Symmetry: C3
Subunit: 211 residues, 3 copies
Amino acid sequence: TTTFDGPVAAERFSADTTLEAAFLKTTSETNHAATIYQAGTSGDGAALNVISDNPGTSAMYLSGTETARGTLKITHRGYADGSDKDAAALSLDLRVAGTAAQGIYVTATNGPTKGNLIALRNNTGLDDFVVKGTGRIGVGIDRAATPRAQVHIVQRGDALAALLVEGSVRIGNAATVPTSVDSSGGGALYASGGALLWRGSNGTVTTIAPA
Amino acid sequence: TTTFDGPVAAERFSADTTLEAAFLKTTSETNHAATIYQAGTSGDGAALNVISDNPGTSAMYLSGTETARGTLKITHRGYADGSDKDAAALSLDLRVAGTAAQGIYVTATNGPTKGNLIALRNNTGLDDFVVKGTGRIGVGIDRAATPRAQVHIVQRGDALAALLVEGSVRIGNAATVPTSVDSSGGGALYASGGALLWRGSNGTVTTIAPA
Amino acid sequence: TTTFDGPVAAERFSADTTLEAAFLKTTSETNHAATIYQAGTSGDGAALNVISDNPGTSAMYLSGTETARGTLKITHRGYADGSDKDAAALSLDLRVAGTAAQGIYVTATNGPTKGNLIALRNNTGLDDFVVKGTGRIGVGIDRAATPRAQVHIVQRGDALAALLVEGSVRIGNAATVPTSVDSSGGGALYASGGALLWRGSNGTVTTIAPA
Ligand code: NA
Ligand code: NA
Ligand code: NA
Protein backbone atom coordinates (compact mmCIF):
# COMPACT_ATOMS: atom_id res chain seq x y z
CA THR A 1 0.00 0.00 0.00
CA THR A 2 1.07 3.56 -0.81
CA THR A 3 -0.30 6.70 0.85
CA PHE A 4 0.07 10.12 -0.77
CA ASP A 5 -0.61 12.90 1.74
CA GLY A 6 -1.47 15.25 -1.14
CA PRO A 7 -2.95 15.28 -4.64
CA VAL A 8 -1.75 13.01 -7.43
CA ALA A 9 -1.75 13.97 -11.10
CA ALA A 10 -0.98 11.55 -13.92
CA GLU A 11 -1.48 10.95 -17.65
CA ARG A 12 -3.85 8.07 -16.88
CA PHE A 13 -5.03 5.83 -14.04
CA SER A 14 -5.68 2.13 -14.53
CA ALA A 15 -6.53 -0.82 -12.33
CA ASP A 16 -7.20 -4.46 -13.21
CA THR A 17 -7.94 -6.02 -9.86
CA THR A 18 -10.06 -8.23 -7.59
CA LEU A 19 -10.45 -5.39 -5.10
CA GLU A 20 -12.80 -2.53 -5.72
CA ALA A 21 -10.79 -0.59 -8.30
CA ALA A 22 -11.86 2.85 -7.04
CA PHE A 23 -13.33 4.43 -3.90
CA LEU A 24 -13.75 8.19 -4.23
CA LYS A 25 -15.27 9.97 -1.26
CA THR A 26 -15.59 13.74 -0.91
CA THR A 27 -17.10 15.73 1.94
CA SER A 28 -17.68 19.30 0.80
CA GLU A 29 -20.21 22.09 0.32
CA THR A 30 -18.60 23.28 -2.93
CA ASN A 31 -16.74 20.40 -4.62
CA HIS A 32 -18.23 17.45 -6.49
CA ALA A 33 -16.79 14.04 -5.59
CA ALA A 34 -15.87 13.32 -9.20
CA THR A 35 -15.88 14.99 -12.60
CA ILE A 36 -15.47 13.00 -15.83
CA TYR A 37 -15.05 15.14 -18.93
CA GLN A 38 -14.67 14.29 -22.62
CA ALA A 39 -13.35 17.45 -24.28
CA GLY A 40 -13.02 15.92 -27.75
CA THR A 41 -15.32 17.54 -30.33
CA SER A 42 -15.63 14.57 -32.69
CA GLY A 43 -14.99 10.84 -32.96
CA ASP A 44 -16.01 7.77 -31.01
CA GLY A 45 -15.13 8.89 -27.48
CA ALA A 46 -17.70 9.00 -24.69
CA ALA A 47 -17.18 10.63 -21.29
CA LEU A 48 -18.10 7.51 -19.34
CA ASN A 49 -18.41 3.87 -20.34
CA VAL A 50 -19.86 1.51 -17.70
CA ILE A 51 -20.12 -2.26 -18.23
CA SER A 52 -21.11 -5.18 -16.03
CA ASP A 53 -20.98 -8.91 -16.72
CA ASN A 54 -22.66 -9.77 -13.41
CA PRO A 55 -26.29 -10.84 -13.80
CA GLY A 56 -26.98 -10.84 -10.04
CA THR A 57 -26.67 -7.09 -9.45
CA SER A 58 -27.54 -3.78 -11.13
CA ALA A 59 -24.65 -2.58 -13.30
CA MET A 60 -25.16 0.81 -11.72
CA TYR A 61 -26.71 2.19 -8.53
CA LEU A 62 -27.51 5.86 -7.95
CA SER A 63 -28.89 7.20 -4.66
CA GLY A 64 -29.67 10.79 -3.69
CA THR A 65 -31.76 12.75 -1.21
CA GLU A 66 -32.62 15.93 -3.14
CA THR A 67 -35.29 18.38 -1.99
CA ALA A 68 -35.75 20.27 -5.27
CA ARG A 69 -33.68 18.68 -8.04
CA GLY A 70 -33.42 15.45 -10.01
CA THR A 71 -31.34 12.58 -8.57
CA LEU A 72 -30.04 12.09 -12.09
CA LYS A 73 -30.19 15.26 -14.21
CA ILE A 74 -29.58 14.82 -17.91
CA THR A 75 -29.08 17.82 -20.17
CA HIS A 76 -28.91 17.52 -23.94
CA ARG A 77 -27.36 20.62 -25.51
CA GLY A 78 -29.17 20.82 -28.83
CA TYR A 79 -28.85 22.63 -32.13
CA ALA A 80 -30.89 25.56 -33.42
CA ASP A 81 -31.12 24.03 -36.88
CA GLY A 82 -32.68 20.84 -35.71
CA SER A 83 -29.71 18.74 -36.82
CA ASP A 84 -30.27 16.59 -33.71
CA LYS A 85 -33.54 14.99 -34.82
CA ASP A 86 -32.05 11.51 -34.25
CA ALA A 87 -30.67 12.32 -30.78
CA ALA A 88 -32.30 11.72 -27.40
CA ALA A 89 -31.61 12.51 -23.75
CA LEU A 90 -32.20 8.89 -22.76
CA SER A 91 -32.05 5.82 -25.00
CA LEU A 92 -32.79 2.26 -23.83
CA ASP A 93 -32.17 -0.94 -25.81
CA LEU A 94 -33.53 -4.28 -24.61
CA ARG A 95 -31.32 -6.70 -26.50
CA VAL A 96 -31.42 -10.44 -27.25
CA ALA A 97 -34.43 -12.05 -28.94
CA GLY A 98 -36.50 -13.91 -26.35
CA THR A 99 -35.82 -11.37 -23.61
CA ALA A 100 -38.56 -10.55 -21.08
CA ALA A 101 -36.74 -7.53 -19.62
CA GLN A 102 -38.74 -4.39 -18.94
CA GLY A 103 -37.95 -0.91 -20.19
CA ILE A 104 -38.76 1.58 -17.41
CA TYR A 105 -40.03 0.58 -13.95
CA VAL A 106 -41.10 3.16 -11.37
CA THR A 107 -42.38 2.48 -7.87
CA ALA A 108 -42.39 3.79 -4.29
CA THR A 109 -41.55 0.97 -1.93
CA ASN A 110 -42.45 2.66 1.38
CA GLY A 111 -45.83 3.90 0.20
CA PRO A 112 -47.16 6.06 -2.63
CA THR A 113 -45.54 9.37 -3.50
CA LYS A 114 -47.66 12.49 -3.72
CA GLY A 115 -45.67 13.70 -6.74
CA ASN A 116 -46.13 13.12 -10.48
CA LEU A 117 -45.03 9.69 -11.66
CA ILE A 118 -44.16 11.12 -15.09
CA ALA A 119 -44.51 14.66 -16.44
CA LEU A 120 -43.74 15.55 -20.05
CA ARG A 121 -43.73 19.34 -20.33
CA ASN A 122 -42.66 20.58 -23.73
CA ASN A 123 -45.32 23.12 -24.68
CA THR A 124 -45.71 26.35 -22.70
CA GLY A 125 -48.67 26.33 -20.31
CA LEU A 126 -49.44 22.63 -20.86
CA ASP A 127 -48.92 19.20 -19.39
CA ASP A 128 -48.45 17.28 -22.63
CA PHE A 129 -48.58 13.94 -20.77
CA VAL A 130 -48.75 13.62 -16.99
CA VAL A 131 -49.51 10.78 -14.60
CA LYS A 132 -50.24 12.17 -11.15
CA GLY A 133 -49.38 10.43 -7.89
CA THR A 134 -53.11 9.55 -7.68
CA GLY A 135 -52.81 7.73 -11.00
CA ARG A 136 -54.96 10.24 -12.89
CA ILE A 137 -53.69 11.09 -16.37
CA GLY A 138 -53.74 14.44 -18.15
CA VAL A 139 -53.20 14.87 -21.90
CA GLY A 140 -52.96 18.53 -22.96
CA ILE A 141 -54.38 19.80 -19.67
CA ASP A 142 -53.22 23.11 -18.23
CA ARG A 143 -49.81 22.63 -16.61
CA ALA A 144 -50.04 21.38 -13.01
CA ALA A 145 -53.83 21.15 -13.12
CA THR A 146 -55.62 18.20 -11.54
CA PRO A 147 -57.13 15.87 -14.17
CA ARG A 148 -60.95 15.77 -13.85
CA ALA A 149 -61.29 12.07 -14.71
CA GLN A 150 -59.08 8.98 -14.62
CA VAL A 151 -57.88 10.14 -18.07
CA HIS A 152 -58.52 13.77 -19.13
CA ILE A 153 -57.79 14.80 -22.76
CA VAL A 154 -57.97 18.31 -24.19
CA GLN A 155 -58.14 18.94 -27.96
CA ARG A 156 -55.34 21.46 -28.63
CA GLY A 157 -53.92 23.41 -31.56
CA ASP A 158 -55.16 22.35 -34.99
CA ALA A 159 -56.14 18.82 -33.92
CA LEU A 160 -59.51 17.92 -35.39
CA ALA A 161 -60.52 15.65 -32.50
CA ALA A 162 -59.52 15.02 -28.87
CA LEU A 163 -59.66 11.25 -29.49
CA LEU A 164 -59.51 9.00 -32.54
CA VAL A 165 -60.21 5.29 -32.14
CA GLU A 166 -59.64 2.94 -35.05
CA GLY A 167 -61.72 0.13 -33.58
CA SER A 168 -64.57 -0.38 -31.15
CA VAL A 169 -65.12 1.21 -27.74
CA ARG A 170 -66.31 -1.00 -24.90
CA ILE A 171 -68.03 0.73 -22.00
CA GLY A 172 -68.61 -1.38 -18.87
CA ASN A 173 -71.62 -0.77 -16.65
CA ALA A 174 -71.06 2.23 -14.37
CA ALA A 175 -70.85 1.21 -10.71
CA THR A 176 -72.44 4.52 -9.80
CA VAL A 177 -74.91 6.33 -12.01
CA PRO A 178 -73.72 9.85 -12.89
CA THR A 179 -75.61 12.78 -11.31
CA SER A 180 -73.51 15.58 -12.81
CA VAL A 181 -71.38 16.53 -15.84
CA ASP A 182 -68.00 18.24 -16.39
CA SER A 183 -67.45 22.00 -16.01
CA SER A 184 -66.70 22.14 -19.77
CA GLY A 185 -70.39 21.33 -20.26
CA GLY A 186 -71.63 18.62 -22.57
CA GLY A 187 -72.63 15.44 -20.82
CA ALA A 188 -71.90 11.98 -19.50
CA LEU A 189 -72.09 8.81 -21.58
CA TYR A 190 -72.39 5.60 -19.58
CA ALA A 191 -73.62 2.04 -19.61
CA SER A 192 -76.31 0.90 -17.22
CA GLY A 193 -77.75 -2.62 -17.17
CA GLY A 194 -76.13 -3.23 -20.58
CA ALA A 195 -77.87 -0.19 -22.16
CA LEU A 196 -76.18 3.01 -23.38
CA LEU A 197 -77.31 6.25 -21.68
CA TRP A 198 -76.55 9.99 -21.88
CA ARG A 199 -76.98 12.54 -19.15
CA GLY A 200 -77.00 16.02 -20.69
CA SER A 201 -75.99 19.30 -19.12
CA ASN A 202 -79.57 20.26 -18.31
CA GLY A 203 -80.01 16.97 -16.48
CA THR A 204 -81.98 15.00 -19.07
CA VAL A 205 -81.23 11.28 -18.98
CA THR A 206 -81.87 9.33 -22.19
CA THR A 207 -81.51 5.59 -22.87
CA ILE A 208 -79.97 5.67 -26.35
CA ALA A 209 -79.82 1.93 -27.00
CA PRO A 210 -80.93 -1.18 -25.13
CA ALA A 211 -79.01 -4.09 -23.69
CA THR B 1 4.74 4.51 -16.80
CA THR B 2 4.54 3.66 -13.10
CA THR B 3 3.23 0.38 -11.67
CA PHE B 4 2.12 0.11 -8.04
CA ASP B 5 1.85 -3.53 -6.97
CA GLY B 6 -0.60 -2.51 -4.23
CA PRO B 7 -3.30 0.05 -3.41
CA VAL B 8 -2.78 3.78 -3.75
CA ALA B 9 -4.45 6.36 -1.52
CA ALA B 10 -4.30 10.11 -2.14
CA GLU B 11 -6.06 13.40 -1.38
CA ARG B 12 -7.19 13.64 -5.01
CA PHE B 13 -6.61 12.11 -8.45
CA SER B 14 -6.51 14.23 -11.59
CA ALA B 15 -5.70 13.66 -15.24
CA ASP B 16 -5.79 16.06 -18.20
CA THR B 17 -4.77 13.88 -21.09
CA THR B 18 -5.25 12.59 -24.65
CA LEU B 19 -5.29 9.00 -23.40
CA GLU B 20 -8.29 7.54 -21.70
CA ALA B 21 -7.97 9.19 -18.29
CA ALA B 22 -9.24 6.17 -16.33
CA PHE B 23 -9.69 2.42 -16.81
CA LEU B 24 -11.08 0.71 -13.71
CA LYS B 25 -11.68 -3.01 -13.99
CA THR B 26 -12.72 -5.26 -11.10
CA THR B 27 -13.41 -8.99 -11.16
CA SER B 28 -15.21 -9.96 -7.95
CA GLU B 29 -18.31 -11.55 -6.44
CA THR B 30 -18.43 -9.05 -3.55
CA ASN B 31 -16.76 -5.77 -4.56
CA HIS B 32 -18.12 -3.09 -6.88
CA ALA B 33 -15.69 -1.80 -9.51
CA ALA B 34 -16.12 1.79 -8.34
CA THR B 35 -17.85 3.79 -5.62
CA ILE B 36 -18.28 7.57 -5.87
CA TYR B 37 -19.62 9.18 -2.71
CA GLN B 38 -20.53 12.77 -1.83
CA ALA B 39 -20.75 12.88 1.97
CA GLY B 40 -21.46 16.62 2.17
CA THR B 41 -24.89 17.42 3.63
CA SER B 42 -25.40 20.80 1.95
CA GLY B 43 -24.06 23.04 -0.81
CA ASP B 44 -23.48 22.72 -4.52
CA GLY B 45 -21.58 19.42 -4.62
CA ALA B 46 -22.79 16.43 -6.62
CA ALA B 47 -21.38 12.91 -6.38
CA LEU B 48 -20.71 12.62 -10.10
CA ASN B 49 -20.52 15.21 -12.87
CA VAL B 50 -20.22 13.84 -16.44
CA ILE B 51 -19.77 16.11 -19.47
CA SER B 52 -19.10 15.51 -23.15
CA ASP B 53 -18.38 17.98 -25.93
CA ASN B 54 -18.37 15.25 -28.60
CA PRO B 55 -21.50 15.26 -30.77
CA GLY B 56 -20.64 11.96 -32.50
CA THR B 57 -21.02 9.67 -29.49
CA SER B 58 -23.22 9.21 -26.41
CA ALA B 59 -21.79 11.10 -23.43
CA MET B 60 -22.42 7.96 -21.42
CA TYR B 61 -22.88 4.25 -22.12
CA LEU B 62 -24.23 1.74 -19.61
CA SER B 63 -24.48 -1.99 -20.31
CA GLY B 64 -25.64 -4.78 -18.00
CA THR B 65 -26.99 -8.32 -18.16
CA GLU B 66 -29.25 -8.50 -15.09
CA THR B 67 -31.75 -11.31 -14.54
CA ALA B 68 -33.90 -9.63 -11.87
CA ARG B 69 -32.76 -6.04 -11.30
CA GLY B 70 -32.54 -2.72 -13.12
CA THR B 71 -29.45 -2.00 -15.27
CA LEU B 72 -29.56 1.49 -13.79
CA LYS B 73 -31.27 1.63 -10.38
CA ILE B 74 -32.08 5.08 -9.07
CA THR B 75 -33.22 5.59 -5.49
CA HIS B 76 -34.47 8.92 -4.21
CA ARG B 77 -34.44 9.04 -0.41
CA GLY B 78 -37.40 11.28 0.35
CA TYR B 79 -38.83 13.20 3.26
CA ALA B 80 -41.85 12.33 5.41
CA ASP B 81 -43.04 15.93 5.39
CA GLY B 82 -43.22 16.18 1.66
CA SER B 83 -40.52 18.85 1.51
CA ASP B 84 -39.29 17.20 -1.71
CA LYS B 85 -42.26 18.17 -3.89
CA ASP B 86 -39.90 19.78 -6.43
CA ALA B 87 -37.50 16.80 -6.56
CA ALA B 88 -37.48 13.90 -9.02
CA ALA B 89 -35.63 10.63 -9.51
CA LEU B 90 -34.91 11.47 -13.15
CA SER B 91 -34.93 14.91 -14.77
CA LEU B 92 -34.30 15.54 -18.49
CA ASP B 93 -33.77 18.94 -20.14
CA LEU B 94 -33.72 19.29 -23.92
CA ARG B 95 -31.92 22.60 -24.34
CA VAL B 96 -31.43 25.07 -27.21
CA ALA B 97 -34.39 26.57 -29.07
CA GLY B 98 -34.78 24.85 -32.44
CA THR B 99 -33.69 21.46 -31.12
CA ALA B 100 -35.33 18.30 -32.50
CA ALA B 101 -33.86 16.00 -29.84
CA GLN B 102 -36.10 13.39 -28.27
CA GLY B 103 -36.71 12.88 -24.57
CA ILE B 104 -36.93 9.13 -23.89
CA TYR B 105 -36.47 6.45 -26.58
CA VAL B 106 -37.02 2.75 -25.85
CA THR B 107 -36.63 -0.12 -28.28
CA ALA B 108 -35.54 -3.76 -28.59
CA THR B 109 -33.21 -4.12 -31.53
CA ASN B 110 -33.10 -7.93 -31.76
CA GLY B 111 -36.87 -8.37 -31.59
CA PRO B 112 -39.67 -7.41 -29.21
CA THR B 113 -39.34 -7.95 -25.48
CA LYS B 114 -42.05 -9.82 -23.63
CA GLY B 115 -41.75 -7.45 -20.66
CA ASN B 116 -43.48 -4.15 -19.87
CA LEU B 117 -42.16 -1.19 -21.83
CA ILE B 118 -43.07 1.15 -18.96
CA ALA B 119 -44.75 0.43 -15.63
CA LEU B 120 -45.68 3.18 -13.17
CA ARG B 121 -46.67 1.51 -9.90
CA ASN B 122 -47.34 3.99 -7.13
CA ASN B 123 -50.68 2.88 -5.68
CA THR B 124 -51.01 -0.48 -3.92
CA GLY B 125 -52.70 -3.15 -6.02
CA LEU B 126 -52.73 -1.03 -9.20
CA ASP B 127 -50.89 -0.41 -12.42
CA ASP B 128 -51.29 3.36 -12.57
CA PHE B 129 -49.89 3.44 -16.13
CA VAL B 130 -48.48 0.41 -17.94
CA VAL B 131 -47.56 -0.33 -21.54
CA LYS B 132 -47.18 -4.08 -22.01
CA GLY B 133 -44.73 -5.72 -24.39
CA THR B 134 -47.75 -6.33 -26.67
CA GLY B 135 -48.36 -2.59 -26.78
CA ARG B 136 -51.61 -2.77 -24.79
CA ILE B 137 -52.04 0.00 -22.22
CA GLY B 138 -53.57 -0.20 -18.76
CA VAL B 139 -54.66 2.84 -16.73
CA GLY B 140 -55.72 1.95 -13.18
CA ILE B 141 -56.00 -1.76 -13.95
CA ASP B 142 -55.18 -4.35 -11.30
CA ARG B 143 -51.40 -4.66 -10.99
CA ALA B 144 -49.89 -7.09 -13.53
CA ALA B 145 -53.26 -7.77 -15.16
CA THR B 146 -53.53 -8.03 -18.94
CA PRO B 147 -55.36 -5.03 -20.45
CA ARG B 148 -58.61 -6.15 -22.15
CA ALA B 149 -58.38 -3.65 -25.03
CA GLN B 150 -55.66 -1.67 -26.78
CA VAL B 151 -56.21 0.91 -24.00
CA HIS B 152 -58.04 -0.17 -20.81
CA ILE B 153 -59.07 2.51 -18.26
CA VAL B 154 -60.61 1.91 -14.84
CA GLN B 155 -62.38 4.70 -12.91
CA ARG B 156 -60.75 4.65 -9.46
CA GLY B 157 -61.10 6.44 -6.13
CA ASP B 158 -63.29 9.54 -6.17
CA ALA B 159 -62.91 10.19 -9.91
CA LEU B 160 -66.28 11.07 -11.41
CA ALA B 161 -65.51 9.56 -14.82
CA ALA B 162 -63.05 7.09 -16.36
CA LEU B 163 -62.53 9.45 -19.32
CA LEU B 164 -63.06 13.16 -19.95
CA VAL B 165 -62.66 14.52 -23.47
CA GLU B 166 -62.73 18.25 -24.07
CA GLY B 167 -63.34 17.94 -27.80
CA SER B 168 -64.81 15.51 -30.30
CA VAL B 169 -64.33 11.73 -30.51
CA ARG B 170 -63.76 10.19 -33.92
CA ILE B 171 -64.57 6.51 -34.29
CA GLY B 172 -63.36 4.82 -37.49
CA ASN B 173 -65.31 1.95 -39.03
CA ALA B 174 -64.62 -1.32 -37.20
CA ALA B 175 -62.76 -3.80 -39.39
CA THR B 176 -64.60 -6.59 -37.61
CA VAL B 177 -68.09 -6.24 -36.21
CA PRO B 178 -68.20 -6.98 -32.46
CA THR B 179 -69.95 -10.21 -31.38
CA SER B 180 -69.33 -9.86 -27.64
CA VAL B 181 -68.85 -7.32 -24.84
CA ASP B 182 -66.46 -6.92 -21.87
CA SER B 183 -66.71 -8.98 -18.67
CA SER B 184 -67.55 -5.74 -16.79
CA GLY B 185 -70.83 -5.79 -18.72
CA GLY B 186 -72.19 -2.81 -20.57
CA GLY B 187 -71.66 -2.91 -24.29
CA ALA B 188 -69.67 -2.11 -27.40
CA LEU B 189 -69.91 1.16 -29.31
CA TYR B 190 -68.64 1.03 -32.88
CA ALA B 191 -68.91 2.55 -36.32
CA SER B 192 -70.10 0.49 -39.26
CA GLY B 193 -70.53 1.87 -42.77
CA GLY B 194 -70.28 5.40 -41.32
CA ALA B 195 -73.16 4.79 -38.85
CA LEU B 196 -72.89 4.60 -35.05
CA LEU B 197 -73.99 1.30 -33.45
CA TRP B 198 -74.27 -0.22 -29.96
CA ARG B 199 -74.19 -3.88 -29.06
CA GLY B 200 -75.62 -4.34 -25.57
CA SER B 201 -74.88 -7.05 -23.05
CA ASN B 202 -77.98 -9.04 -23.98
CA GLY B 203 -76.88 -9.03 -27.60
CA THR B 204 -79.18 -6.35 -29.01
CA VAL B 205 -77.60 -4.39 -31.85
CA THR B 206 -78.97 -0.88 -32.47
CA THR B 207 -78.04 1.64 -35.18
CA ILE B 208 -78.05 4.86 -33.16
CA ALA B 209 -77.29 7.31 -35.97
CA PRO B 210 -76.82 7.04 -39.72
CA ALA B 211 -73.86 7.75 -41.95
CA THR C 1 1.31 17.37 -4.64
CA THR C 2 2.78 14.66 -6.88
CA THR C 3 2.95 14.80 -10.68
CA PHE C 4 3.45 11.66 -12.75
CA ASP C 5 4.48 12.51 -16.31
CA GLY C 6 3.13 9.14 -17.48
CA PRO C 7 0.46 6.56 -16.73
CA VAL C 8 -0.10 5.09 -13.28
CA ALA C 9 -1.31 1.55 -12.65
CA ALA C 10 -2.31 0.23 -9.23
CA GLU C 11 -4.35 -2.46 -7.47
CA ARG C 12 -6.83 0.17 -6.30
CA PHE C 13 -7.30 3.94 -6.01
CA SER C 14 -8.94 5.53 -2.98
CA ALA C 15 -9.52 9.05 -1.71
CA ASP C 16 -11.32 10.29 1.40
CA THR C 17 -11.03 14.03 1.11
CA THR C 18 -12.55 17.53 1.23
CA LEU C 19 -11.25 18.27 -2.26
CA GLU C 20 -12.91 16.88 -5.32
CA ALA C 21 -11.67 13.29 -5.15
CA ALA C 22 -11.33 12.87 -8.92
CA PHE C 23 -11.03 15.04 -12.03
CA LEU C 24 -10.65 12.98 -15.21
CA LYS C 25 -10.43 14.93 -18.44
CA THR C 26 -9.68 13.41 -21.84
CA THR C 27 -9.45 15.15 -25.21
CA SER C 28 -9.57 12.54 -27.96
CA GLU C 29 -11.35 11.35 -31.10
CA THR C 30 -10.92 7.67 -30.19
CA ASN C 31 -10.60 7.26 -26.41
CA HIS C 32 -13.35 7.53 -23.80
CA ALA C 33 -12.52 9.65 -20.74
CA ALA C 34 -13.28 6.78 -18.38
CA THR C 35 -14.23 3.11 -18.45
CA ILE C 36 -15.60 1.32 -15.37
CA TYR C 37 -15.94 -2.43 -15.78
CA GLN C 38 -17.25 -5.18 -13.49
CA ALA C 39 -15.98 -8.44 -14.97
CA GLY C 40 -17.41 -10.65 -12.21
CA THR C 41 -20.08 -13.07 -13.45
CA SER C 42 -21.99 -13.48 -10.18
CA GLY C 43 -22.40 -11.99 -6.72
CA ASP C 44 -23.26 -8.59 -5.31
CA GLY C 45 -20.83 -6.41 -7.27
CA ALA C 46 -21.99 -3.54 -9.46
CA ALA C 47 -19.82 -1.65 -11.94
CA LEU C 48 -20.61 1.76 -10.46
CA ASN C 49 -22.13 2.82 -7.16
CA VAL C 50 -22.94 6.54 -6.78
CA ILE C 51 -24.26 8.04 -3.54
CA SER C 52 -24.97 11.57 -2.35
CA ASP C 53 -25.99 12.82 1.08
CA ASN C 54 -26.39 16.41 -0.15
CA PRO C 55 -30.03 17.48 -0.53
CA GLY C 56 -29.17 20.78 -2.27
CA THR C 57 -27.78 19.32 -5.50
CA SER C 58 -28.43 16.47 -7.94
CA ALA C 59 -26.43 13.38 -6.96
CA MET C 60 -25.47 13.12 -10.61
CA TYR C 61 -25.27 15.45 -13.61
CA LEU C 62 -24.90 14.29 -17.21
CA SER C 63 -24.52 16.69 -20.15
CA GLY C 64 -23.99 15.89 -23.82
CA THR C 65 -24.42 17.46 -27.24
CA GLU C 66 -25.19 14.47 -29.47
CA THR C 67 -26.54 14.83 -33.01
CA ALA C 68 -27.80 11.25 -33.49
CA ARG C 69 -27.41 9.26 -30.28
CA GLY C 70 -28.71 9.17 -26.72
CA THR C 71 -26.97 11.32 -24.06
CA LEU C 72 -27.31 8.32 -21.77
CA LYS C 73 -27.53 5.01 -23.65
CA ILE C 74 -28.54 1.99 -21.61
CA THR C 75 -28.28 -1.51 -23.03
CA HIS C 76 -29.67 -4.54 -21.24
CA ARG C 77 -28.18 -7.75 -22.61
CA GLY C 78 -31.04 -10.20 -22.20
CA TYR C 79 -31.63 -13.93 -22.29
CA ALA C 80 -33.26 -15.99 -25.04
CA ASP C 81 -35.18 -18.06 -22.50
CA GLY C 82 -36.86 -15.12 -20.90
CA SER C 83 -35.15 -15.69 -17.56
CA ASP C 84 -34.93 -11.89 -17.20
CA LYS C 85 -38.65 -11.25 -16.71
CA ASP C 86 -37.92 -9.39 -13.45
CA ALA C 87 -35.14 -7.23 -14.94
CA ALA C 88 -35.41 -3.73 -16.39
CA ALA C 89 -33.18 -1.24 -18.20
CA LEU C 90 -34.16 1.54 -15.80
CA SER C 91 -35.63 1.16 -12.31
CA LEU C 92 -36.67 4.10 -10.09
CA ASP C 93 -37.64 3.89 -6.41
CA LEU C 94 -39.17 6.89 -4.62
CA ARG C 95 -38.51 6.00 -1.00
CA VAL C 96 -39.77 7.28 2.37
CA ALA C 97 -43.49 7.38 3.19
CA GLY C 98 -44.75 10.96 2.91
CA THR C 99 -42.47 11.81 0.00
CA ALA C 100 -43.72 14.15 -2.74
CA ALA C 101 -40.83 13.43 -5.12
CA GLN C 102 -41.60 12.90 -8.78
CA GLY C 103 -40.57 9.93 -10.88
CA ILE C 104 -39.62 11.19 -14.36
CA TYR C 105 -39.63 14.87 -15.37
CA VAL C 106 -38.96 15.99 -18.95
CA THR C 107 -38.89 19.55 -20.24
CA ALA C 108 -37.19 21.88 -22.73
CA THR C 109 -36.18 25.06 -20.97
CA ASN C 110 -35.28 27.17 -24.02
CA GLY C 111 -38.46 26.37 -25.92
CA PRO C 112 -40.25 23.24 -27.15
CA THR C 113 -38.37 20.49 -28.93
CA LYS C 114 -39.61 19.24 -32.27
CA GLY C 115 -38.74 15.65 -31.33
CA ASN C 116 -40.75 12.93 -29.56
CA LEU C 117 -41.03 13.41 -25.82
CA ILE C 118 -41.27 9.63 -25.34
CA ALA C 119 -41.29 6.81 -27.89
CA LEU C 120 -41.80 3.17 -26.93
CA ARG C 121 -41.01 1.05 -29.98
CA ASN C 122 -41.10 -2.66 -29.26
CA ASN C 123 -43.24 -4.09 -32.05
CA THR C 124 -42.06 -3.96 -35.67
CA GLY C 125 -43.76 -1.27 -37.74
CA LEU C 126 -45.53 0.31 -34.74
CA ASP C 127 -45.30 3.12 -32.26
CA ASP C 128 -46.59 1.27 -29.21
CA PHE C 129 -46.77 4.52 -27.21
CA VAL C 130 -45.51 7.87 -28.47
CA VAL C 131 -45.92 11.46 -27.33
CA LYS C 132 -44.89 13.81 -30.12
CA GLY C 133 -43.26 17.19 -29.61
CA THR C 134 -46.70 18.69 -30.41
CA GLY C 135 -48.16 16.77 -27.49
CA ARG C 136 -50.23 14.44 -29.69
CA ILE C 137 -50.26 10.81 -28.54
CA GLY C 138 -50.21 7.67 -30.66
CA VAL C 139 -51.10 4.20 -29.34
CA GLY C 140 -50.45 1.44 -31.89
CA ILE C 141 -50.12 3.87 -34.79
CA ASP C 142 -47.75 3.15 -37.65
CA ARG C 143 -44.19 3.93 -36.55
CA ALA C 144 -43.27 7.61 -37.00
CA ALA C 145 -46.75 8.53 -38.25
CA THR C 146 -48.41 11.74 -37.10
CA PRO C 147 -51.34 11.07 -34.73
CA ARG C 148 -54.63 12.29 -36.27
CA ALA C 149 -56.14 13.49 -32.98
CA GLN C 150 -54.87 14.59 -29.58
CA VAL C 151 -54.88 10.86 -28.73
CA HIS C 152 -55.00 8.32 -31.59
CA ILE C 153 -55.54 4.60 -30.75
CA VAL C 154 -55.43 1.69 -33.19
CA GLN C 155 -56.91 -1.72 -32.31
CA ARG C 156 -54.09 -4.20 -33.05
CA GLY C 157 -53.52 -7.95 -32.99
CA ASP C 158 -56.22 -9.98 -31.25
CA ALA C 159 -57.50 -7.10 -29.11
CA LEU C 160 -61.29 -7.08 -29.11
CA ALA C 161 -61.59 -3.31 -28.74
CA ALA C 162 -59.42 -0.20 -29.23
CA LEU C 163 -60.68 1.21 -25.91
CA LEU C 164 -62.27 -0.25 -22.78
CA VAL C 165 -63.60 2.10 -20.12
CA GLU C 166 -64.78 0.72 -16.80
CA GLY C 167 -66.71 3.84 -15.85
CA SER C 168 -68.43 6.79 -17.48
CA VAL C 169 -67.20 8.97 -20.35
CA ARG C 170 -67.67 12.72 -20.09
CA ILE C 171 -67.66 14.68 -23.32
CA GLY C 172 -67.44 18.47 -23.02
CA ASN C 173 -69.10 20.73 -25.57
CA ALA C 174 -67.00 21.00 -28.74
CA ALA C 175 -65.62 24.51 -29.23
CA THR C 176 -65.90 23.99 -32.97
CA VAL C 177 -68.54 21.82 -34.58
CA PRO C 178 -67.00 19.04 -36.71
CA THR C 179 -67.37 19.35 -40.51
CA SER C 180 -65.44 16.20 -41.43
CA VAL C 181 -64.51 12.70 -40.21
CA ASP C 182 -61.32 10.60 -40.10
CA SER C 183 -59.80 8.90 -43.16
CA SER C 184 -60.57 5.51 -41.53
CA GLY C 185 -64.23 6.38 -42.10
CA GLY C 186 -66.87 6.11 -39.43
CA GLY C 187 -67.83 9.39 -37.86
CA ALA C 188 -67.47 12.05 -35.20
CA LEU C 189 -69.20 11.94 -31.82
CA TYR C 190 -69.44 15.29 -30.04
CA ALA C 191 -71.38 17.33 -27.54
CA SER C 192 -73.11 20.53 -28.58
CA GLY C 193 -75.19 22.67 -26.22
CA GLY C 194 -75.23 19.75 -23.75
CA ALA C 195 -76.68 17.32 -26.35
CA LEU C 196 -74.91 14.31 -27.88
CA LEU C 197 -74.49 14.37 -31.69
CA TRP C 198 -73.01 12.15 -34.43
CA ARG C 199 -71.72 13.26 -37.79
CA GLY C 200 -71.53 10.23 -40.10
CA SER C 201 -69.24 9.67 -43.05
CA ASN C 202 -71.89 10.70 -45.56
CA GLY C 203 -72.33 13.98 -43.71
CA THR C 204 -75.56 13.27 -41.83
CA VAL C 205 -75.73 15.03 -38.47
CA THR C 206 -78.02 13.47 -35.84
CA THR C 207 -78.84 14.69 -32.32
CA ILE C 208 -78.82 11.39 -30.43
CA ALA C 209 -79.82 12.68 -27.00
CA PRO C 210 -80.80 16.06 -25.57
CA ALA C 211 -79.21 18.26 -22.95
NA1 NA D 1 -51.78 20.60 -33.39
NA1 NA E 1 -59.24 9.88 -6.92
NA1 NA F 1 -52.99 -8.57 -29.09
